[PDB]
Amino acid sequence: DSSMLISLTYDVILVILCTVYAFKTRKCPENFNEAKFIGFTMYTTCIIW
């Protein structure tokens, strides 16, 4: 399992970067304020992981 987590650390990093960039773009009303949903999805994905 340690090797499996070492494998998944890259997806963890990808999630971190995506969450940071979603947070930086909370207030773009494009696509009927889709950026808010993107940020919320990133936050809850971080929580679940």
Next chain:
Amino acid sequence: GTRVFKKASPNGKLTVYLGKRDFVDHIDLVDPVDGVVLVDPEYLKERRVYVTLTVAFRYGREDLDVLGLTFRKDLFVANVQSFPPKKPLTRLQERLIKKLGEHAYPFTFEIPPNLPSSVTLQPGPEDTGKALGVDYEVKAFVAENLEEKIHKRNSVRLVIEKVQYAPERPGPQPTAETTRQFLMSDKPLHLEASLDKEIYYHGEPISVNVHVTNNTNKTVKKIKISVRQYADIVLFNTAQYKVPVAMEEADDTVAPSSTFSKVYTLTPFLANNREKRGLALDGKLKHEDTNLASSTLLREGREILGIIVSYKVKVKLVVSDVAVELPFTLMHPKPKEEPPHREVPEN
């Protein structure tokens, strides 16, 4: 002792006369759109001619065009049956009627306040369709009712403008200071900037006074002082078009934990910045050269509509970056007679 503007139609000779191309915008109320029409009888039964004012708003971005969609909304539409085969006359209308004769029929509109001023987004070299922005059109149709399709053989189109000019009251002079505490314990660093006044006439110099007091051991690498322009769009949830229209990356190294005050001059102008597509410029009649957008002011109590343009001087210091924004307004003074609505020397 004055002059008006005239347009004509082939089939019906519907000569539409308008007092002026533009119509200034007092915050409380917009000047009336009053004019007349000569309607020679080119018919036997089709005795109706209608005048329609439309404050159209067109928009589309580069990637929006790439995908193949551009938005357009009719913010305001007014239809008046100017020919009674209501609307009491005015002085200019009376003079025009005295000139014209019996068939002269008046038509009067009022633009409800807080409607966006005539601002057009600058098209790119590839952009060749209808100009994107807020454009006001007055049209005349010779038909019966609205069931018949609007025929180009009879309609008359003229492009009008709705603009604002700088108020006499300067308003509060913009000024802003920010002190940032660095990660090294709580060590402050103060930046302060001030402007000459709040309303700037187009082309006038901006003498941003900037003073920095660094309470740290670091050094300021460079000072990027720019004039950012924000063109908010209030339809279809489109993002805020931000675009720097003037800049100066003036580099100055200052002694650690010391003070340094001076003034940096910036002037917005279209010569250096004629490429940034989507930029907001004042109303263009037919692709004529115009200045930057006149900074709209919603002094009424108001509703966000159309394209809301504003200008703010942003001062940034490197090492991350200490940024300060000083909003202001860029607008023409009150003109004496009228703008020529074109390059003053034609060719």
